[PDB]
RNA sequence: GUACGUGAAAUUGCUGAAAGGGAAGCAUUGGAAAUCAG
RNA sequence: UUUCAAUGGCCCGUCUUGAAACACGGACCAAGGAGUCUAGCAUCUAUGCGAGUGUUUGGGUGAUGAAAACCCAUCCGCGAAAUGGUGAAUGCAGGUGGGAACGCCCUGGCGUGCACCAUCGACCGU
RNA sequence: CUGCCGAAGUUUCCGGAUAGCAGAAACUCAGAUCAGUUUUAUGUGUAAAAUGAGAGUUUCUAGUGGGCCAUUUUUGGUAAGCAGAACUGGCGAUGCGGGAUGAACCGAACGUGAGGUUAAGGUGCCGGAAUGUACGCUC
RNA sequence: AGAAGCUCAGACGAGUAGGCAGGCGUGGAGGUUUGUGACGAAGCCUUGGGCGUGAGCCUGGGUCGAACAGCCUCUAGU
């Protein structure tokens, strides 16, 4: 406001390829909370599917540890260490065209 | 304790005597060569915080009370508990009917009126 | 800074409460808390629930029942999945952090509740947030 | 209730004994010096009195037109104002200081009455970086109890005789704020004291000046 | 405490407070009451009244 | 009273009071005269 | 308030210079009259939320004024990953020292040790 | 409108970045370090007692980058002036007492007042204060 | 105990560039004062009084004839 301006007090003083990246530690966070309660920590024959393309991510990177629960990761691209950690956690990677 | 004022004369703006366009309301001189800002001899004095009066007697009239502006009988009632501290001063736009009502109520309450004999 | 620029009435109430506690006790904790309440938001960075979980069970761990105290926001850390039991007192909790701590863990506390529980700061861990920003 | 009254009463008697002891010491020291001088004169011998370990310095020139080298020394002497008097431990490290601020200060040997009157009238202590008047012995006791100084008489003794804790006592005393001399200075005041002025060393005439300033 | 400063020299009561010894001082003592020994060496007098 | 609501200052005339031997205004302390306040 | 007496009192602004003086401005009074609005960027502070955040392009809706308030589908902006295609806990997401704060003791000792800073260390900046 | 803090007045490198002076924010430090200072010791410089003061850093952000006058040393001097450096001062941001009057001379540095006492300079009168005291010189 | 407050003690006070803080006044807006007003609002005048260090504020009297203000916030062609 003009009233609080300090010129009110000077009166009188003479004056590429689109590819957002997601790391492994956030892969389970993308999935909703009720599915995590169902699939995470339980040895179920059916595994959850995390299509990281539908969540606005182009590539899955390898930062972080995944929990030992297997999970199917559907994506376009994946860093070489990321899918190493994925099968070490028991999951598989399905590259999406 | 009595009321003593460090000064009685008002502070006049410089050369307000000489010029009718220059009002007597104080204005601090910004002139670099202003001998009056430099505090030369014979020149008039400038407002200083050293002229501030006693805290315990500031805002107090000669009688020792503080003037309080009053518009109606409701305002006077607010001065019931401070009749030895505040003196009621009826506003200048209060009609003659409300003047006499305010004065009577303050007199009954024991509250001083500064300008009672008016209108 | 003798007073905070915040006009929040409840922040002023906390400052009043810890003004008394700082001067009527001999706790360097209470003096520290009063100073951090005066500090601006720039100097009160958020601390994550994961860093709190780390600093409790770090090195020799020995967290026991010690209550974590931070003058700031305890933001959640969604990367960590299984949340331990924690007792934190803070200015604010993000809705995620408060929900996660309560569901699987201990309790959340405000700074007035902590002053009742531990007026002298006994068995309290005073944790700051990373200012590297 | 009774414990504090008894302790303070015993403390009061203890101070009286110390003051009595100090008074006898001054009388004996003066008398023995007179006897030594008398015996020297009778034998034809010459007796040299000891050097004065104590000096009293009064700043006689103001804060205007003073060289920076001389200004710093008066800052170190706490002579930050005109007509300010302080006690200095007169030694080889001080003689050189006072010799270069000769035109700006005067100093001399203060007798017991000068020290006794100064602390009684102008005595102010530096308590928590404040100028508190020495109006009662407990003020000195709480501020100099580590050095076994309990009363004004103890403080006077520690200053007059230049005891082991003279530095602490002199630093405790806020510089005395003396008035302008009663009767005035000499006609020309900034000439050297020897040459008819009022500046520099003056030996036993610092007393005659100080009594004017009190 | 200590609203006014009272000079102990001009206040007999304040002097008693500060110095619990002024009640017994005996300022003046008569010590020159024996045969006054005129102590001045003859050689000293010659040196004094020299030239 | 149409030279029209309110009627400021500059400026001008009259009356009253006072001052004035080649400036004046101003400031400080009081007196005198006038006028107020408690 | 006016006036007298004693004492004091050089015309204000601007400009130039180390500084004045000069050099302009000023017959008098009233009214008007000069760092404003906006776009971007950056600092600091406050506020809301916080790995998120941002309703107001637009749609819904709003009977009492409906250009307000209210509600939000899909996108999008910045942030969450850097480096020059690839793309990060080796090691409690690493040890040593100082350190806020706390605890146990009989000032000091011991333990714990945030922020930050020097240190050996890693991983593709973390 | 009042109050508080308060400079630079110029190096060092290419109009500037820098430093310096002034502030703010955040740190650690009181069995600690500083200093327009003096002693002591070693050979003017170096190192360790006196006295005073709480002493440090990091970030960042304003203003300043002139001159004048004077002292001392010194370089030449020259009809005689002066000219060239350095030096720290004084002014500059600053009123007041005195010097009859005054940018640079002697004192003194400032909130509003009462009382007391002085500085520099003065005490025949203007003019506050001895037509004081003592000894000389001068027409 | 308007802790924003109350109280005790000491020191300090020129100040350009610059820095920082608190206040005064004006037009209009939201709220509020059971607010003022033709028994006289606003304005104006006055050798009337009071308050404030100051910007300014309140008031007596006169004149005048229809609107106006205090506090808390907002705003600026202040």
UniProtKB/Swiss-Prot annotation, chain A:
Location comes to: Cytoplasm
Gene Ontology cellular component terms for the protein in this record: cytosolic large ribosomal subunit; preribosome
Record's Pfam families? Ribosomal_L27A (PF00828)
SUPFAM superfamilies assigned to the protein according to its UniProt record, in alphabetical order: Ribosomal proteins L15p and L18e (SSF52080)
- All disulfide bonds of the chain are none
- Composition-biased stretches (Basic residues): 1-12
Q: Does the keyword Ribosomal protein apply?
A: yes
**A molecular-function term among this protein's GO annotations:** structural constituent of ribosome
A single Gene Ontology biological process assigned to it is: cytoplasmic translation
Record key words, sorted:
Cytoplasm, Ribonucleoprotein, Ribosomal protein
- Superkingdom of this protein's organism: Eukaryota
In terms of InterPro entries, this protein maps to: Ribosomal_uL15, Ribosomal_uL15/eL18, Ribosomal_uL15/eL18_sf, Ribosomal_uL15_CS
- Principal localisation: cytoplasm
State any further remark. Answer: There are 2 genes for uL15 in S.pombe.
Primary role? Component of the ribosome, a large ribonucleoprotein complex responsible for the synthesis of proteins in the cell. The small ribosomal subunit (SSU) binds messenger RNAs (mRNAs) and translates the encoded message by selecting cognate aminoacyl-transfer RNA (tRNA) molecules. The large subunit (LSU) contains the ribosomal catalytic site termed the peptidyl transferase center (PTC), which catalyzes the formation of peptide bonds, thereby polymerizing the amino acids delivered by tRNAs into a polypeptide chain.
Record text on subunit structure and interactions: Component of the large ribosomal subunit (LSU). Mature yeast ribosomes consist of a small (40S) and a large (60S) subunit. The 40S small subunit contains 1 molecule of ribosomal RNA (18S rRNA) and at least 33 different proteins. The large 60S subunit contains 3 rRNA molecules (25S, 5.8S and 5S rRNA) and at least 46 different proteins.
Spell out the HAMAP family in the cross-references: Ribosomal_uL15 (MF_01341)
Swiss-Prot record, chain B:
One cellular component term (GO) for this entry is: preribosome
User: Of which family is this protein a member?
Assistant: Belongs to the eukaryotic ribosomal protein eL32 family.
Q: Which GO terms describe its molecular function?
A: structural constituent of ribosome
Would I find Coiled coil among this entry's keywords?
no
Assembly with partners or alone: Component of the large ribosomal subunit (LSU). Mature yeast ribosomes consist of a small (40S) and a large (60S) subunit. The 40S small subunit contains 1 molecule of ribosomal RNA (18S rRNA) and at least 33 different proteins. The large 60S subunit contains 3 rRNA molecules (25S, 5.8S and 5S rRNA) and at least 46 different proteins.
The highest taxon in the source lineage is Eukaryota
Ribonucleoprotein recorded as keyword: yes
The biological process GO terms on file are: cytoplasmic translation
Query: Any further remarks?
Result: There are 2 genes for eL32 in S.pombe.
Mind listing the UniProt keywords for this protein, alphabetically?
Answer: Cytoplasm, Nucleus, Phosphoprotein, Ribonucleoprotein, Ribosomal protein
SUPFAM superfamilies given for it?
Ribosomal protein L32e
- What exactly does this protein do? Component of the ribosome, a large ribonucleoprotein complex responsible for the synthesis of proteins in the cell. The small ribosomal subunit (SSU) binds messenger RNAs (mRNAs) and translates the encoded message by selecting cognate aminoacyl-transfer RNA (tRNA) molecules. The large subunit (LSU) contains the ribosomal catalytic site termed the peptidyl transferase center (PTC), which catalyzes the formation of peptide bonds, thereby polymerizing the amino acids delivered by tRNAs into a polypeptide chain.
Where Phosphoserine occurs along the chain? 74
Q: Which PANTHER family match?
A: 60S RIBOSOMAL PROTEIN L32 AND DNA-DIRECTED RNA POLYMERASE II, SUBUNIT N, RIBOSOMAL PROTEIN L32
Could you tell me where this protein is found in the cell?
Cytoplasm; Nucleus
Curated annotation (Swiss-Prot), chain C:
One biological-process term from Gene Ontology? cytoplasmic translation
The UniProt entry's GO CC annotations, sorted and at most eight, read:
cytosol; cytosolic large ribosomal subunit; preribosome
Q: Which UniProt keywords apply?
A: Cytoplasm, Phosphoprotein, Ribonucleoprotein, Ribosomal protein
Tell me if Glycoprotein is a UniProt keyword of this record.
no
Q: Where in the cell is it found?
A: Cytoplasm
Which superkingdom? Eukaryota
Phosphoserine occurs at which residues?
2, 50, 122
Gene Ontology MF terms in the entry: RNA binding; structural constituent of ribosome
Q: Which residues carry this modification: Phosphothreonine?
A: 73, 75, 120, 124
| Family note | Belongs to the eukaryotic ribosomal protein eL18 family.
Protein role: Component of the ribosome, a large ribonucleoprotein complex responsible for the synthesis of proteins in the cell. The small ribosomal subunit (SSU) binds messenger RNAs (mRNAs) and translates the encoded message by selecting cognate aminoacyl-transfer RNA (tRNA) molecules. The large subunit (LSU) contains the ribosomal catalytic site termed the peptidyl transferase center (PTC), which catalyzes the formation of peptide bonds, thereby polymerizing the amino acids delivered by tRNAs into a polypeptide chain.
Q: Could you describe the subunit structure of this protein?
A: Component of the large ribosomal subunit (LSU). Mature yeast ribosomes consist of a small (40S) and a large (60S) subunit. The 40S small subunit contains 1 molecule of ribosomal RNA (18S rRNA) and at least 33 different proteins. The large 60S subunit contains 3 rRNA molecules (25S, 5.8S and 5S rRNA) and at least 46 different proteins. eL18 interacts with NAP1.
Comment field (misc): There are 2 genes for eL18 in S.pombe.
Name under which the protein is recorded: Large ribosomal subunit protein eL18A
Q: Which gene encodes it?
A: rpl1801
Swiss-Prot record, chain D:
Give the residues annotated as coiled coil.
Answer: none
Its lineage opens with: Eukaryota, Fungi, Dikarya, Ascomycota, Taphrinomycotina
> Which Pfam family would be a valid example here?
Ribosomal_L30_N
One GO biological-process annotation of the entry reads: maturation of LSU-rRNA from tricistronic rRNA transcript (SSU-rRNA, 5.8S rRNA, LSU-rRNA)
| More about this protein | There are 3 genes for uL30 in S.pombe.
Give the record's subunit note.
Answer: Component of the large ribosomal subunit (LSU). Mature yeast ribosomes consist of a small (40S) and a large (60S) subunit. The 40S small subunit contains 1 molecule of ribosomal RNA (18S rRNA) and at least 33 different proteins. The large 60S subunit contains 3 rRNA molecules (25S, 5.8S and 5S rRNA) and at least 46 different proteins.
Instruction: Write out the GO MF terms.
Output: RNA binding; structural constituent of ribosome
Kindly provide the name given to this protein in its UniProt entry.
Answer: Large ribosomal subunit protein uL30B
Q: Where can this protein be found?
A: Cytoplasm; Nucleus, Nucleolus
Q: Which UniProt keywords apply?
A: Cytoplasm, Nucleus, Ribonucleoprotein, Ribosomal protein
Look up the record and report any one GO term of the cellular component aspect: cytoplasm
Function according to Swiss-Prot or TrEMBL: Component of the ribosome, a large ribonucleoprotein complex responsible for the synthesis of proteins in the cell. The small ribosomal subunit (SSU) binds messenger RNAs (mRNAs) and translates the encoded message by selecting cognate aminoacyl-transfer RNA (tRNA) molecules. The large subunit (LSU) contains the ribosomal catalytic site termed the peptidyl transferase center (PTC), which catalyzes the formation of peptide bonds, thereby polymerizing the amino acids delivered by tRNAs into a polypeptide chain.
Q: Record's superkingdom?
A: Eukaryota
Q: Which NCBIfam families match?
A: uL30_euk
């Amino acid at each position: 406001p003009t009233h609080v301006s300090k010129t009110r007090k000077l009166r009188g003083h003479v004056s590429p390829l689109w590819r957002p990246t997601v790391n492994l530690d956030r892969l389970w966070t993308l999935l909703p909370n009720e599915a995590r309660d169902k699939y995470l920590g339980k040895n179920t024959e059916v595994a959850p599917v995390i299509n990281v393309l539908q969540s606005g991510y182009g590539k899955v990177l390898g930062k972080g540890r995944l929990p030992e629960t297997p999970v199917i990761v559907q994506t376009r691209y994946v860093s070489r260490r990321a899918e190493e950690k994925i099968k070490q956690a028991g999951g598989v990677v399905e590259l999406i065209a | 304790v009595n009321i003593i004022k460090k000064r009685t004369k008002p502070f006049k703006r410089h050369q307000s005597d000489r010029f009718k366009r220059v009002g007597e309301s104080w204005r601090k001189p910004r002139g670099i060569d202003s001998c009056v800002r430099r505090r030369f001899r014979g020149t008039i004095s400038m407002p200083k915080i050293g002229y501030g009066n006693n805290k315990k007697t500031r805002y107090c009239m000669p009688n020792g009370l503080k003037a309080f502006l009053v518009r109606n009988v409701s305002d006077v009632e607010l001065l019931l508990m401070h009749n030895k501290t505040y003196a009621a001063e009826i506003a200048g736009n209060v009609s003659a009917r409300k003047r006499v009502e305010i004065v009577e109520k303050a007199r009954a309450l024991g509250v001083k009126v500064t300008n009672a004999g008016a209108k | 800074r003798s007073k905070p620029a915040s006009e929040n009435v409840y922040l002023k109430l906390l400052v009043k409460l810890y003004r008394f506690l700082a001067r009527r006790t001999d706790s360097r904790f209470n003096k520290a808390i009063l100073k951090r309440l005066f500090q601006s938001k720039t100097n009160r960075p958020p601390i994550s629930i994961s860093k709190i979980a780390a600093l409790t069970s770090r090195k020799s761990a020995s967290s026991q029942n010690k209550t974590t105290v931070v003058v700031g926001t305890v933001t959640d850390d969604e990367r960590m999945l299984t949340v331990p039991k924690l007792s934190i007192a803070a200015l604010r909790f993000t809705k995620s952090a408060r929900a996660r701590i309560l569901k699987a863990g201990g309790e959340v506390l405000t700074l007035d509740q902590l002053a009742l529980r531990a007026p002298t700061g006994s068995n309290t861990v005073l944790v700051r947030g990373k200012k590297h920003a | 209730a009774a414990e504090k009254k008894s302790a303070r009463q015993k403390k009061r008697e203890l101070i009286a004994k110390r003051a009595e002891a100090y008074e006898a010491e001054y009388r004996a020291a003066e008398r023995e010096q007179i006897e030594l001088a008398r015996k020297a004169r009778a034998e034809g011998n010459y007796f040299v009195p000891h050097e004065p370990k104590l000096i009293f310095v009064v700043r006689i020139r103001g804060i205007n037109n003073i060289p920076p080298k001389a200004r710093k020394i008066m800052q170190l002497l706490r002579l930050l104002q005109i007509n300010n008097g302080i006690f200095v431990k007169f030694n080889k490290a001080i003689k050189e200081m006072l010799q270069v601020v000769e035109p700006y200060v005067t100093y001399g040997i203060p007798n017991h009455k000068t020290v006794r009157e100064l602390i009684y009238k102008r005595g102010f202590g530096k308590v928590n970086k404040q100028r508190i008047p020495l109006s009662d012995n407990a003020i000195i006791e709480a501020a100099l109890g580590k050095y076994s100084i309990l009363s004004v008489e103890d403080l006077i003794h520690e200053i007059y005789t230049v005891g082991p804790n003279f530095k602490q006592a002199a630093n405790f005393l806020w510089p005395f704020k003396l008035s302008s001399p009663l009767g005035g200075w000499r006609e020309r005041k900034f000439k050297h004291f020897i040459e008819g002025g009022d500046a520099g060393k003056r030996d036993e005439h610092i007393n005659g000046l100080v009594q004017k300033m009190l | 405490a200590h609203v006014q400063k009272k000079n102990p020299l001009k206040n007999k009561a304040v002097l008693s407070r500060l110095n619990p010894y002024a009640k017994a001082y005996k300022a003046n003592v008569k010590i020159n009451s024996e045969k006054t020994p005129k102590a001045a060496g003859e050689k000293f007098l010659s040196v004094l009244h020299e030239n």
